[model samples]
Target chain A: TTPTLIRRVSIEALDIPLHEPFGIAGGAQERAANLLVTVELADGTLGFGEAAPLPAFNGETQDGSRAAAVSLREAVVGSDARAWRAVARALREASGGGAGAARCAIETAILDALTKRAGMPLWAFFGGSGTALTTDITITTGSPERAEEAARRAAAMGFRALKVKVGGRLAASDPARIEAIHAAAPGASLILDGNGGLTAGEALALVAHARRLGADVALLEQPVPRDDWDGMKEVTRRAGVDVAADESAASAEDVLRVAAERAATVVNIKLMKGGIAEALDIAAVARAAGLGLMIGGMVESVLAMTASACFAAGLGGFSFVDLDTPLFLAENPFDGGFVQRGPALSLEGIRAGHGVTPQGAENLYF
Target chain B: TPTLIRRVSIEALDIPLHEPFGIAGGAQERAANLLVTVELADGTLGFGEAAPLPAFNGETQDGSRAAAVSLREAVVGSDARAWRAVARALREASGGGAGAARCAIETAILDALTKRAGMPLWAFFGGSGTALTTDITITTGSPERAEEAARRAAAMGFRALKVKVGGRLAASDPARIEAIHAAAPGASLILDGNGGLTAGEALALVAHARRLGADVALLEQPVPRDDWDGMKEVTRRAGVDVAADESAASAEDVLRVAAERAATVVNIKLMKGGIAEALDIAAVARAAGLGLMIGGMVESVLAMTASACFAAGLGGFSFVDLDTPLFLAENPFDGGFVQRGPALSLEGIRAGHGVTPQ
Candidate 1:
């Protein structure tokens, strides 16, 4: 058997409009500014990776991601795809240790092609723990009527978990929206995501207000600023609910600090933070610290969302999943990733790679 | 591509060693291991071995054989592709005290799966590299015997020598270290107390070795497994990396080790349980900024090859103690990884662990 070397790496811009403008604590976006990375092995095997960057969330832009992706081509081309860990290290070093989304995309592409060559799926490559995951739908910040309507629709569509956007100017009205959603969809689990918009006092008050309304707040995510370690710890101590560090925890070192300081009970993992390797490290640190794991992603397509689903499912033991960004897309540019039945993402038929390819787009290739 | 297991079989073997292998924990003149074979529905077979040391973990050969037999009910018809799921079921079936059995069965499953995929186990584990420089162990013995063994290993091109210490002869360990260092002054030394020395005693030995200008690279499990405070004491003050061996058997144990700052390095042995758990431990250790070492019980080249593939495939291991196979009087397996002196190379392995009973 001949060793397959990486022959080509292509990075292309991907712009997908959303069905409705998605609003969060940080800001609102009407479109996904993503980049698609393609890695071709010498044997003609192709692997795909997507960089979904939300500058408001991770400080990574489409142009910057493309630049980082371009910077990695020279180091990646002519390397053996089987030696992925070494390749990943080179990618890390060549990218100057920043541009996590780009690094993740290239790493994912290489592993995708490598696993495809081995006749296995990415999930199997991860561990073959399972091939199915249940994701929660996110309800962006909106009027109480809009929130109630979305909650009803999600409940009717069999989504038992609803991630409600909170904080920012909507903090006062968030309680009303929460009450309306709870009234519209009774017995649904409410996950309040502040996106690092509140103070410790505000976070505690919001949890207390939700309790006063007899609504079950399953989790409070990133209730304080990314650097407000004391605020996070304070809220975690008083909220009596699971506090998840989303923006506050980016690297393994940050997660270790969270574990050491008892800041949060859960760490939300985003591939855009550091790619698959860093996410795996975060999960390991969280697990070691006896914290819950929640795998989320930026505004993404089915291509990237299913990749996250495959990661969560492959590793198994994820207590919460927020992979609903694909459902918000008006047009899915990729074909054949995961089959979504309401909130459940199933990778049953994905045989190799991430099981996705650009849909009828010849321009996607260089 | 669903490779289902059609059969599971276990066989017992008692192989003689070149000499009585004595450690701080126990001594053995013969290695009693159980060989496990998992046959896929397509007639492909994968092999694994269970080397259980009673003094180390209290798991015996017959006990492991019974546990392995009991695990067939969960494994015989399962798909090997879902190795993690099958591994979880095996853990539940065997319960506790059957880590070696679980490891053997899981290895066999992965062996068949990777073979069916036409990929080597090293490639399946991320394909970092295939060549590994391992350290040979100088078992607990008199100073004269230790010096002779050290010289023989040095002559064989082994640059790292792991010398066992701490037993009835705990006080004379400094002399043994001195003699071995005198014989092979260029080799780095790793003193393994095997949970036999207290924190103070461990410190005293390190101090003694320092006075003699011995280049002690690591100190492994100086205190008992449950003595986290003692382990931390040695790790904080010993000025050498302390490895958690028996103190860390599972991923959860590694977590505790990290949380308590008990040791700076984790010694991952597949005999602790299964490949899945070992991978988890390695990931956790890495996340915690801890070092990694791969070791195995007295076993054949088959099990050692799997561990070697794991260590080589991941490629962050700081210490590799896989020289126990060289102590066997005869090779019971054929066609595994090639070991030239202290270097274990998986370049010739095509699929699975690349070993079979001869």
Candidate 2:
């Protein structure tokens, strides 16, 4: 049991360099900037949360996350730290919504505090039976030769599934890219994510072409723009392949609306969009509506990736897991929490809360 | 990268029991403890113990140790984290026969997995809580001795007791039941014949227990395990719950029992095979709406602890027969788990078996 008042809140920033620039439909980034949040209790126990934002993916920058954390520090100074949900509410009231990455950092920090105080691992608290989880690795967007090489690398690393970046001008070349990757790793399951860069017609045409080429697509993700509801629904109805909504199903309400509209059969839940609590709630909403649940992450460190994996392992409803972002990091700062042998994951050294600490880092604390 | 197995070693041990152990088919005064160690490339060592009882699954101590030795070379250099596949490899290497030997290999691999994951076997495997209640056994003996054992166990605060039956005259069977019941009137009773009776005798025993107003929780293996028709007939005729013990070894056999409505509960033991296979059988039985009991042969705390972890992890087992360790004169191991009277605790348990060789 811990005392009530919030003792302190602090932000720690870490720059994680990638093996290569992570690519998407619009652009690429050479490094991933991650912001870490810590909430300390009066009794001296500490809990942590993370904000990993991609400037290109969601237009949220890491610098902005620090600013939001600073504001959150002031928002919950005297509130009950043990009641993280209430702290989260107070932080949200101060922020007035829309600061997803920041909200995620604060909300998760409070939850971690409570979870650790109770001496339950996040997965156990959320009802996980085992540490067994398998995830897919994403091959960055590039030439067919590059895609083929990356796919082989992922396969060689023991990953069972590979997600390829498609859509935008690259939509036209997707067929060639798919063929090259498939030829390189014949047995790997494939998922195609368009990053909201394709039109409905182009998305359908690519799905049609892939089927004709016998590419065996496991699922298609966010083929059209996030706001293109009509285009998403039409593609879902016309395309025989399963289409998943990534950006369109950003919030719980959005996921419910998409499910009601049958916009997509699969829903992706990323912590950067709303942090651990919201992502979990979104999973509940998606499961209730009979939509497939997926837990995804941005290009980040092992901390964010491990937390997401633990949550996903607990939910168990996720048919698709895109938590291979940490595999792209040039180096890992943490040693325990999870072990990734190829794409297979086993939660290791699980204690209370997230059950991990930053390892071998030179006290990079603010 | 897959964690590879670096080495395998086997050791034989024995723990003298305070009393001569009696079951339906045989009697023994000491428990065989087969210690199996699997070393992984990551420098993690997993420990497992197998207590083979011929009366349970026709497996012997020497035979299981030999079988475990045959698996050393095959197990080395195999993936440790790919446990399900590793179990399949062990099954194939061992020719899918020796229940106790396969169980040792499987338990060792599971230990490595739990250690690698840094979670206790109970929590990592999804056990709802830490503590589980267990029932001590009153071995198959003379009616006077059986009554004394049951009275002592009940005095020790064991609310459940498994009474061994069969191997006696038809008339003595009812007297044995009546004697044990009169001694521990408050305890839930399990009558285990160990497949030593005819179907007609099994029906007669149940009828006698019902007439005496005895609380027989389950009737176990009253006839030959393979005597499916006889077992089914006894189950249909008995008013009390019927359980299949030796007859329920593999998942296939358990499913067959469910299909035939042969029994209301299935007894799952690690010695019958591996932990993975045991869990598979538990899932099948639970899904088919049959009650589950985690039972084990007489062994030291090593195998008994693993069985307890399985019981805690699976969470749906209605009966706990993991009191084999209590019968041992002394426990040769210690880690995080505690066995006191009828309570099994996993508090502060480390990853893996939560047990280290003592």
lDDT by residue for model 1 (B1-358), tens: 4477899999987877774233223354789998999999889898988999998989999999988888888888887777888888887787655988999988988888887777789877867888999998887778988888888888889989898889777767988999999999999999999999989999999898878888999999999998988999999999999999989887778777888889999999999888878887898888778999999998888899999989988878999999878888778788888878888899888788888888
DockQ of all predictions against the true structure, Cα-based: 0.60, 0.02
RMSD of candidates 1 onward, in order: 2.9, 11.1
* Candidate 2 CAPRI level: incorrect
Provide the overall lDDT of each model, using Cα atoms, as 2-decimal numbers: 0.85, 0.75
Q: Model 2: residues >4 Å from true position, as ranges?
A: A1-366, B1-5, B20-28, B39-45, B78-85, B109-120, B167-171, B198-200, B230-237, B334-339, B348-358
Which window of 10 residues has the lowest lDDT sum in candidate 1 chain A? Answer: A357-366
Residues A286-327 of candidate 2 have per-residue lDDT tens digits of 665578877787776777777887778765657998988787
Give the CAPRI class of candidate 1: medium
lDDT of 2 by residue, B1-358 (tens): 3357898889987887775233233344777768899888878888888788876667888998988888777778876645655666677787888778878887887787667655567644544456889888887657887788887787778888787778755457777888888898887888888888888987888788767777778888888877999889988888777888878877767657876888989998888888767866775666556899888877677787788877776576788888776666767787846866788887657577787877
Error of 2 at B208 (Å): 1.8
Positional deviation of residue A250's Cα in model 2 after best superposition, in angstroms: 22
Give the CA lDDT, 0 to 100, for residue B293 in model 1.
98
